[model samples]
Target: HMMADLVISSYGGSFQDAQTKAYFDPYAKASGVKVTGTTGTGYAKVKAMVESGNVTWDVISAESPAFASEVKDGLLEPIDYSVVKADNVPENFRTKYGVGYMVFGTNLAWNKDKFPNGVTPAQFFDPNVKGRRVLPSDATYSLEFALMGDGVKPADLYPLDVKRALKVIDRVKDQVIGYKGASDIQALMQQGEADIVYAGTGRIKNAIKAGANWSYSWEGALADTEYWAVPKGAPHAAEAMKFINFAVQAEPQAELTRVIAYGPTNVDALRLLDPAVAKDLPSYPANAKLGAVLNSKWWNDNYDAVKAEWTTYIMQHHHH
Candidate 1:
């Protein structure tokens, strides 16, 4: 057994808190490593660290496009899968520079008591549901969700039909009650300011626990994958690998699934979850079947152009 120093970087979000509690805390205690953790917006910081050859963080948990684009540009270290049972993980969950840490989806969630029949993406953007519905202000991620809501099937979403999607937004332009970030959607729902909203399924669990009348629609859920990667020239490469290996183990992975209400990459961890909890996880077989697997590789290739278009559209249309 070898001990190495490590610093882990993650995004500042609700899930980060869960990761710290479920995995990082127990891991540091058991492994006797000084686990330094910091938060950032995205993989840009990791890329900057690697490119400058002054890498500070040993590992990073980021969205899949960051891993794909960074690995494509040689900004990441090739993971030594030999150290971990990589084959035991699903093919969709494994990658060259990182491994799938969680399966999350941006789906339509609404206060069911208000809507009764539950709201779909189409309904959320419909003039009929306007003023009562809210959308996250993230255009890049939610663009695809908007497209699907416009009647584009999950399979037909990529090579995005931007024109049609914008038409849908155009139709509901005046109906938008508010443009919110991730942090604001739950509160909007809880306070009764919003009857329908778009967000990760993980948020629904907390809302339900607090007695918010919310329900999630798996139909047309926009699935996004988050990954764990070791930065090139990381200070504790070996120890970071150990942490990756440990985090993916059955117990921690399952506990994570139970606590955070997200999908675990580890297959065996499913057995450890409560039936009720397991039923809601995005990784659950039934839920996974309905989710639209977001293509990060495609997005990585076209983000520059798509981002420009998205920015222009938002600037022109969004009042707030």
Candidate 2:
């Protein structure tokens, strides 16, 4: 019996619950490994852990850009697929340092009761809806939405035109109710305070069920997938690899999607989901038709400059 200690961290909210129930709990039960879970944003803590060389986490699930940025700095270990079979994993999701565990999209999700005709991203920025709209504080994710709403095509989004993107925000400067961090957006939507919101698919599911009038528009939606990775110098490298393999199997993946509402990356898991639920998932063929996968690699390469520029722009437009 191989027993190991594993530490898992996440960005909180519905994803935090999914990681805990879908991955951590089951993985511990099946592998008999002792697991510790914590919640935190990825890029800052991950960088601090790696640079200090006193790394604590064995596996971390984070947004794609954070995983990409960390991988760029050599803070993550190259994935070892030897223990984990590579047969059905999609090529776009498998990377040197991480493997996409689940997929979701950020789009214009609006209160359905508020707009019976359905709302577009462009509508969120309209002067009519100004002061009732909420946008995410996540730069990379939210910026793409703003660009698409401003009429940039998914293919042309790369080499992102930050100057042009912010200019679009300038058009509706006073309309924003608030620019929210990940934590605040969901609550703002669930209450009646926000009519149209920009956020991930997970939050949309939770909010809609709570009787919020929200619906997601896949058109020009920015799709992104989260990765499961073991930090460099992690204490339980081999055990972590085993956990990843088992967690990605059909049963666990299916259970995860059922519990959390995010799309599982495992191809076989789709068969296990109820037909209706599967149809609704963002990664499902039907929903995916409305959106484009975000290119994390492109963002990874350009984030340094983009972050600075975006920060400056937001500061000037902060009151809006």
lDDT of each: 0.74, 0.77
Give candidate 2 regions above 4 Å deviation.
Answer: 1-4, 113-116
CA deviation > 4 Å runs, candidate 1 = 1-5, 52-54, 174-181, 190-193, 283-286
Give the candidate number with the greatest lDDT.
2
Q: How many backbone clashes does candidate 2 have?
A: 7
Write one digit per residue (lDDT tens) for candidate 1, span 100-131. Answer: 87877777887777878777777766787744
lDDT of 1: 0.74
Residues 11-113 of candidate 2: C-alpha lDDT, one tens digit per residue? 6776677667878888888877787677775787888987898977888887888887888888888888898774566777777788887887777777667
Q: Would you estimate the TM-scores of all the predictions?
A: 0.85, 0.89
Kindly provide the TM-score of model 1 when superposed on the true structure, using C-alpha atoms.
Answer: 0.85
Span of ten consecutive residues with least summed lDDT in model 1: 130-139
